[PDB]
Amino acid sequence: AIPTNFTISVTTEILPVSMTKTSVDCTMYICGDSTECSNLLLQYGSFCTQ
Amino acid sequence: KGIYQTSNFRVQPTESIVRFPNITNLCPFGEVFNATRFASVYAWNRKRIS
């Protein structure tokens, strides 16, 4: 079975590439500008830097 | 070399503000602590205070 006519087709291929460059401050989310809560938080160490 | 999203220590609060309702009435502590008669336990008294 041999083709005698053809066609040129166009297809769309969608690919995600990036995401929203989120960033988080622990102190606001967890404590909310409260120094005492931050002081208690310091006992946890390097979770937030991580 | 580079850019760093540093933690947020720059500003710290300085003073306090206290706001309360404008009531000068003294509460009737006497009428409950300094009472001629207390209710018996089965019929304990319930006093609204306001």
Ligand SMILES: *[C@@H]1O[C@H](CO)[C@@H](O[C@@H]2O[C@H](CO)[C@@H](O)[C@H](O)[C@H]2NC(C)=O)[C@H](O)[C@H]1NC(C)=O
């Ligand atoms: C091969 O096939 C293509 C279609 O895939 C043909 O193109 C059509 O031909 C008809 C008849 O000649 C026209 O009415 C259409 O307008 C043509 N298409 C377009 C987009 O213009 C082509 O003619 C065929 N060739 C042969 C030799 O059969």
Ligand SMILES: *[C@@H]1O[C@H](CO)[C@@H](O)[C@H](O)[C@H]1NC(C)=O
């Ligand atoms: C209480 O309310 C009155 C009227 O709203 C206002 O003038 C007054 O400054 C307030 N505070 C005190 C202590 O009365």
Ligand SMILES: *[C@@H]1O[C@H](CO)[C@@H](O)[C@H](O)[C@H]1NC(C)=O
């Ligand atoms: C309760 O009674 C005692 C003595 O009767 C009195 O010294 C005291 O001031 C009274 N309490 C109040 C709140 O006035």
